């Protein structure tokens, strides 16, 4: 994309401080998740290939962002640190992939068989035969080649950078001085040289020209940087370009012939090497013993020989140190197993008895690495990435889990989001491959990962990672995740994401509502409890009325929705919230139980039919009856407050006055007719519903049919108490509404319905409400007596 190119081109010259590191870290997560869901654990090769591609991409992005300005501020310093940590994470991922490939290749040949042990010519055949006898040297040479590839990748475009200053002519000053001395007998008043060969001064022990020595030192630096990377083509190219091919011609004596030619038609490949490798390594040992030259040749002689005494200060980096140690130990083992089994008369490598009678293993490497007395290595063996690499190489579990426990006890003062993501992916790959860890550290890793995810936000990345958690913990955490969700667009997006990932968001919301109700501990249970003194609504009613949005947003669990609605309605009736109850009833439809039984009969599952449907039906019917009674009561009181639709004398003394009076009388008669009609209809309905409750002893509101229901025995007793307290109240309210309807045919029984069926004494019937409603009935009877009635 040209946008990145133009942005970095403008940032390299602009005078601003812009850090797109946060944007890069926020954008690398969706791409990583997409790559993960595109390439599963089956095609691990293509998965790691795409991973390395995207990782090199973001590494180039971050390195350009860093190099676009001088890293002097703390922000750019931390950006460079993050870039280095990303390079280290990618090299550890490469090591992990290599180790996984090696383990997969070795799992098919763990068991072997030995039968042939007779030696032959050319030690390469014996080496190839012993390679299949032990995997230690196998992984040793694999790590060696991995470090060589690391050096080759870290060298970069040095082959092209050389062309910007590669010379061609050498010994110019020496040739000029020799010409001056030969033509004028002057110009060489110093220890001069004899020949123009690179070995002539080193043989005569008399040097010449410090500039030539510095140029040779720089050329040797270039040769060392080219050879350390594992290259030879560019090395001989630079040699032929300059003129110092003597080093390349000399670095070709420690090889061996490839005895494989059996006829004349086959190409001649057994021409490289020499059988004098023993005396060659002996001379190299002598050179390493009497080493008194430059650091580069000292190190190359140490690596070609294997003297640890002088290799200890030769090793510059930890990679070179472990490479030299591995090479030394594998060479010692191979030479011992070859000599002591065939012939041992001439020790090629001067190794005493203490080194000859000692079988080196793998733990000794880490032993000497930790025992390194150098302060630099001691500090490097105590950080984070070095110990991670060591544990990955050793494939340990006890020390690994111990260090992870110490890290968790320390906290998040070392790990980050990308580190946690890489650790989770490595743990998932290990669990998919073989073995596992502990449940405690597993759930700790999962909770830390989901906490970092919810901190980084991005709702499109939470559902694709929650499913990896155990169902219980996944649901328990998705509850808190969805507790803070707003906006209809984001809600439907999260719904679609959960439906695509396979998560039960419906049961998640149900558990959310259940947990909120359990935390609120209800509101005065399911019984009419008056508050103390003067107080407003409860603090939990706001949350109870706000949680209904996400509940109704998913129209699928209508049964549970209406059950929770009846529960919160009982809670509101207990905590005095008739206004909110009426608003919720007006918001929700009336065919709720209709849709409930429709879905129940459409789901084709009538064998396991409980009593929850009938309980919800009864609860909704009782709630509707109570709300209708309350609305009829308040409408009747408002009509009583208004003129009672009677010709009230307000002053009539003119034609217009009498016309207005007649119009008001007609309007009053019409309003009275409509009022009596609708009130008589509603009151007849209420009385027909009440007549089936009067014959009972206790009550008959919000009851239960049989067992197997959502309500609890305590909730059942609370509902029984509420219905027993409300039955006389509901009957008295019905009788009060049935008064001004001018139809006393169904009200003349009020003089005897007071002392009718009442076996239980007036104790828990709430004396206040029953006395107030009996007084209301007495007042209505007095009003009817004034309006002519018994």
């Amino acid at each position: 994309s040209p946008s990145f190119t133009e942005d970095i081109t403008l940032s390299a010259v602009m005078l601003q401080e812009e850090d797109p590191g946060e944007a890069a870290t926020m954008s690398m997560y969706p791409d990583f998740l997409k790559s993960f869901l595109e390439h599963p654990s089956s095609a691990v090769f293509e998965l790691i290939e795409q991973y390395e591609a995207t990782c090199n991409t973001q590494i180039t992005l971050l390195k350009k962002i860093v190099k676009r300005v001088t890293p002097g501020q703390q922000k750019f310093s931390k950006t460079a640190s993050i870039l280095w940590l990303l390079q280290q994470e990618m090299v550890t991922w490469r090591l992990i992939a290599a180790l996984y490939r090696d383990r997969i290749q070795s799992a098919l040949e763990e068991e072997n068989m030995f039968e042939i042990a007779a030696p032959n010519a050319s030690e390469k055949t014996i080496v190839d035969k012993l390679f299949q006898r032990d995997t230690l040297v196998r992984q040793s040479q694999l790590v060696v080649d991995w470090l060589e590839s690391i050096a080759k990748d870290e060298v970069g475009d040095f082959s092209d950078n050389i062309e910007y200053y590669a010379k061609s002519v050498y010994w110019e000053n020496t040739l000029h001085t020799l010409k001056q001395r030969s033509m004028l007998s002057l110009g060489s008043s110093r220890p001069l040289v004899s020949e123009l060969d690179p070995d002539a001064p080193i043989r005569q022990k008399l040097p010449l020209d410090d500039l030539d020595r510095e140029d040779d030192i720089r050329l040797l630096k270039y040769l060392f940087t080219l050879i350390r990377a594992g290259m030879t083509d560019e090395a001989q190219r630079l040699c032929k370009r300059c003129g110092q091919a003597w080093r390349a011609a000399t670095l070709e004596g420690w090889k061996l012939y490839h005895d494989a030619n059996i006829n004349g038609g086959t190409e001649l490949q057994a021409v490289e090497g020499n059988p004098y490798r023993c005396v060659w390594k002996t001379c190299c040992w002598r050179m390493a013993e009497d080493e008194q030259f430059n650091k580069y040749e000292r190190a190359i002689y140490a690596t070609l020989s294997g003297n640890l005494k002088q290799l200890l200060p030769v090793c510059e980096s930890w990679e070179d140190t472990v490479w030299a140690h591995f090479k030394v130990m594998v060479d010692s083992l191979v030479e011992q197993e070859i000599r002591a089994s065939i012939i041992s008369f001439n020790e090629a490598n001067e190794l005493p008895r203490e080194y000859l009678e000692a079988n080196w293993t793998l733990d000794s490497v880490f032993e000497e690495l930790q025992a390194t007395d150098k302060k630099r290595v001691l500090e490097e063996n105590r950080e984070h990435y070095h110990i991670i690499q060591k544990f990955v190489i050793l494939a340990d579990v006890d020390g690994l889990m111990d260090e992870f426990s110490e890290w968790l006890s320390n906290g998040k003062n070392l790990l980050l989001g990308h580190l946690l993501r890489f650790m989770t992916h490595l743990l998932l790959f290990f669990r998919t491959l073989g073995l596992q860890a502990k449940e405690e550290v597993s759930v700790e890793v999962l909770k830390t990962y989901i906490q970092r995810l919810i901190n980084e936000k991005q709702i499109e990345l939470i559902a694709f990672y929650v499913s990896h958690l155990p169902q219980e913990l996944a649901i328990s955490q998705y509850a808190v995740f969805l507790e803070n969700i707003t906006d209809p667009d984001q809600r439907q997006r999260c719904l679609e994401l959960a439906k695509e990932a396979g998560l039960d968001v419906a049961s998640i919301t149900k558990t959310v509502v259940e947990n909120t109700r359990k935390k609120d501990a209800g509101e005065f249970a399911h019984h009419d409890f008056a508050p103390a003194l003067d107080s407003g609504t409860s603090e939990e009613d706001r949350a109870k009325i706000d949680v209904i949005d996400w509940l109704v947003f998913d129209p699928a669990q209508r049964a549970e929705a209406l059950k929770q609605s009846n529960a919160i309605m009982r809670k509101f009736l207990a905590s005095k919230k008739h206004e909110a109850a009426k608003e919720v009833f007006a918001k929700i439809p009336q065919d709720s139980i209709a849709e409930i039984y429709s879905q129940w009969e459409e789901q084709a599952m009538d064998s396991a039919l409980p009593a929850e449907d009938d309980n919800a039906i009864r609860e909704h019917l009782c709630i509707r009856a109570y709300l209708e009674s309350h609305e009829a009561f308040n409408e009747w009181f408002k009509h009583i407050n208004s003129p009672p639709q009677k010709p009230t004398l307000v002053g009539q003394a003119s034609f217009t006055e009498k016309v207005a009076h007649e119009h008001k009388e007609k309007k009053y008669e019409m309003d009275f007719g409509i009022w009596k009609g609708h009130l008589d209809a509603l009151t007849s309905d209420v009385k027909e519903k009440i007549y089936n409750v009067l014959l009972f002893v206790d009550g008959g509101w919000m009851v239960d049919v049989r067992e197997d229901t959502e309500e609890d025995p305590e909730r059942s007793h609370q509902m029984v108490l509420l219905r027993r307290l409300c039955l006389p109240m509901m009957c008295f309210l019905l009788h009060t509404v049935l008064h001004n309807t001018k139809q006393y045919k169904d009200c003349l029984r009020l003089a005897d319905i007071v002392s009718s069926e009442n076996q239980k004494l007036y104790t828990v019937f709430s004396k206040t409400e029953m006395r107030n409603l009996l007084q209301k009935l007495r007042e209505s009877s007095l009003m009817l007596l004034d309006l002519q009635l018994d």
Partner: protein, 654 residues
């Protein structure tokens, strides 16, 4: 980074402290009314007094460059649109570059002293000769004609040109009688003509001679002198590319002119954006190794008319953003820096058609970051920044200065010395901001209104009491005590103590001074009596609540009183109509408690004679009838539950 505002008294930079003190003196002089000199000279003398020398010399150079006789523009857009001021500033920058080279030569002479290979001698020509002898006393290869006392005449002429000593150049020309060719008259004319008028034919002949012969000599000074005289090309480099770009820039400015003068033709002049791009790309940061000496880069950026680029470069340095903001406010006082909107974009913004270097400085974004990088700082620097923030007019409602001062006061919450002390309900005092700016009453009123809209109560009440506003004080008191009336009033938290102390402050303010309006005082007394009855009922007493609600003389007593009660209800308020629910609830609770006690007490036994019982029943009948008539004939309805409870108490007392 920068010198941010330390929380309260701490330790700041001496430079910023002296600058704030000088700004305080400037504001004091402005308030006094006498004409102020110039803050640039005060800043210069402060930098000279301070121990710092590098930034002091930098500000001295900036002052000497800005003290040119130029008309003060309005914005960077107008400055870049005007053409005469651009070439005038370019000529002034060239003159000041010549003066700076002369000062550098003087400094080198002072460093070389007198007895060191012919040291400096008083006089311009003698100083130039001494500098030449110090630099290169040996005869440079490529000499023509003779020499003056064995010194290179070409190098002497080049040094005189670079220093700008035209009188010394005239003296050198007069001394070089037979030591030069037949161009002495041309040199004299070129020196005496400020507009460079030395005959177009002679100029063309010299240009042709330079293009023909003078193109490969071993004398770089002579080559550069002949090129400058003949006016050839736009840039002629010989050996100046060696960490000394001053001579190269001087040669480029001398060979390139915006206006067509003598011997003016294509391929002999360039544009200002060309030099801007050359200094921004080829001579930018981390390119020509100029990061170790940012002063030279800032100087050349200010000379090449790149004010925005110089400001950005000074801001990018460490411990220099303070000086960047200082020179920015100095340019704002001198009326520069084009205003630009934006609060989330970068500081350097431009439009299609604008060259690099001269960009549109986002003053809004600059002020936003300046206010965001600050903490509750000292009031002195706060007022010093407000003196600059108040210069901006209104921008999309209110003002940025007003928004900033509102945010600062709501984040600090302190005004006993900045706005005025308070004994208990006193007036305002001439604070620090009041001693410099007026409209303090309206400012405090707006701040208190913003605090009330946000969610502040006690501090807003104290601010309104300081500003003396009984109407607003009683309004906020009622607005804060209305929602608490609905809930309980028992001593259980701190809201009751807060409302009690607020009521005490309001009543003492009303006692000592003029209160609020008639309706406001009536509502205040009503709310006082209501909360008194509320606490009396919550304390557990019934007879006290009954007698206070009877002595209030405002509840419906009898049928003849319902009429006047309804008549007075029409002159109430929203709060007086809303709290009626809780008032009736408490009244019905007290009445039900009294009725329950009366029913528990025996009619003939346990005290309370039958006549007293009948009198209590009759007074309850009257109270219930009055209350129900009121609630029935008032033009206001509430809820079914409240109505049902009202009728319940009506029939209970009936």
């Amino acid at each position: 980074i920068s010198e941010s505002g330390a929380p309260g008294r701490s330790s700041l930079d001496n430079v910023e402290m002296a600058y704030a003190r000088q700004m305080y003196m400037y504001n004091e002089k402005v308030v006094s009314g006498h004409l102020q000199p110039s803050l640039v000279d005060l800043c210069t003398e402060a930098a000279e007094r301070l121990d710092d020398k590098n930034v002091s010399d930098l500000w001295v150079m900036v002052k000497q460059m800005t003290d040119v006789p130029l008309i003060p523009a309005s914005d960077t857009l107008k400055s870049r649109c005007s053409g005469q001021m651009q070439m005038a500033f370019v000529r002034q920058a060239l003159n000041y570059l010549e003066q700076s080279y002369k000062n550098y030569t003087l400094i080198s002479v002072f460093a070389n002293l007198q007895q060191a290979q012919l040291g400096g001698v008083p006089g311009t020509y003698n100083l130039v000769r001494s500098f030449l002898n110090i630099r290169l006393p040996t005869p440079i290869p490529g000499l023509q004609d003779g020499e003056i006392e064995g010194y290179p005449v070409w190098a002497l002429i080049y040094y005189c040109m670079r220093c700008g000593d035209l009188m010394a150049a005239q003296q050198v020309v007069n001394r070089a009688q037979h030591q030069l060719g037949d161009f002495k008259n041309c040199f004299q004319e070129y020196i005496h003509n400020k507009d460079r008028r030395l005959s177009p034919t002679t100029e063309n002949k010299l240009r042709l001679h330079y293009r023909r012969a003078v193109r490969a000599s071993t004398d770089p000074y002579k080559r550069a002198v002949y090129c400058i005289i003949g006016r050839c090309d736009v840039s002629d480099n010989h050996s100046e590319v060696a960490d000394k770009t001053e001579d190269y820039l001087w040669l480029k400015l001398s060979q390139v002119c915006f206006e067509d003068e003598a011997n003016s033709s294509p391929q002999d002049r360039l544009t200002l954006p060309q030099f801007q791009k050359q200094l921004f790309e080829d001579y930018g940061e981390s390119h020509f190794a100029v990061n170790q000496q940012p002063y030279l880069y800032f100087q050349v950026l200010f000379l090449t008319a790149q004010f925005e680029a110089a400001i950005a470069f000074l801001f990018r340095l460490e411990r220099t953003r303070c000086h960047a903001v200082h020179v920015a406010l100095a340019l704002f006082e001198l009326k520069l820096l084009l205003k630009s909107t934006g609060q989330s974009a970068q500081l350097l913004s431009q439009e299609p058609g604008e060259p690099q270097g001269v960009r549109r400085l986002n003053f809004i974004r600059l002020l936003m970051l300046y206010t965001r990088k600050f903490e509750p700082t000292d009031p002195r620097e706060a007022l010093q920044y407000f003196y600059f923030l108040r210069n901006e007019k209104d921008n999309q409602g209110e003002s940025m200065f007003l928004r900033c001062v509102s945010e600062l006061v709501i984040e600090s919450r302190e005004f006993d010395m900045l706005l005025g002390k308070l004994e208990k309900d006193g007036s305002r005092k001439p604070g620090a901001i009041d001693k410099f700016t007026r409209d303090t009453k309206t400012i405090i009123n707006k701040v208190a209104s913003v605090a009330e809209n946000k969610g502040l109560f006690e501090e807003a009440a104290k601010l309104y009491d300081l500003a003396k506003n009984p109407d607003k004080v009683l309004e906020l008191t009622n607005k804060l005590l209305s929602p608490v009336v609905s809930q309980i009033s028992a001593p259980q938290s701190n809201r009751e103590r807060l409302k009690n102390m607020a009521l005490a402050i309001a009543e003492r303010y009303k006692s000592q001074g003029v209160s609020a309006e008639k309706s406001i005082n009536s509502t205040f007394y009503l709310l006082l009596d209501l909360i008194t009855f509320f606490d009396e009922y919550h304390a557990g007493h019934i007879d006290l609540s009954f007698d206070v609600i009877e002595r209030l003389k405002l509840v419906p007593l009898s049928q003849d009183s319902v009429e006047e009660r309804v008549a007075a209800f029409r002159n109430f308020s929203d709060e007086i109509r809303h709290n009626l629910s809780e008032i009736l609830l408490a009244t019905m609770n007290i009445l039900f408690t009294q009725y329950k006690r009366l029913k528990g007490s025996g009619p003939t036994t346990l005290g309370r004679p039958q006549r007293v019982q009948e009198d209590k029943d009759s007074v309850l009948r009257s109270q219930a009838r009055a209350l129900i008539t009121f609630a029935g004939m008032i033009p206001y309805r509430m809820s079914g539950d409240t109505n049902a409870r009202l009728v319940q108490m009506e029939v209970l007392m009936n």
